[PDB]
């Protein structure tokens, strides 16, 4: 079953990406995190990364889409 602690961790990770707190993840926020890992992606490469998990086609990552990303990293 889903727990409130699990929910809490998910929310922490999302917020680590969503810096301005508006509930969506932009190419610029993605960029910030990827550069902190030691990579140097172009704007278009960041957009290709969004395009992989963008299930509603709106061009940015929301919470359930982020959940998909984590699903793939852990599993
Ligand atoms: Ca945001
Ligand atoms: Ca989306």
Angle at 48 between CA 44 and CA 54, to 5 degrees: 130
Q: Which of the ligands is closest to the CA of residue 18?
A: 1
Residue 15 CA to ligand 1 centre (angstroms): 9
Task: List residues bridging with 25 in a β-sheet.
Answer: 61
Which residues does the annotation place in the binding site for Ca(2+)? 18, 20, 22, 24, 29, 54, 56, 58, 60, 65
CA-only gyration radius of the chain, Å: 13
Residue 25 CA to ligand 1 centre (angstroms): 5
**Experimental technique of record:** X-ray
In DSSP notation, 2-62 reads --HHHHHHHHHHHHHH-SS-SS-B-HHHHHHHHHHTT----HHHHHHHHHHH-TTSSSSB-
Q: What sign results for the dihedral spanned by CA atoms 66, 69, 74, 75? A: positive
Resolution in Å, one decimal place: 1.9
Residue 2 CA to ligand 1 centre (angstroms): 25
């Amino acid at each position: 079953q889903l727990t409130e602690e699990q929910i809490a961790e998910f929310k922490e990770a999302f917020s680590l990406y969503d810096k301005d707190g508006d509930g969506t993840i932009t190419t610029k926020e993605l960029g910030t995190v990827m550069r902190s890992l030691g990579l140097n992606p172009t704007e278009a490469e960041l957009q290709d990364m969004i395009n992989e998990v963008d299930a509603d086609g709106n061009g940015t990552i929301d919470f359930p889409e982020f959940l998909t990303m984590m699903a793939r990293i852990m599993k």
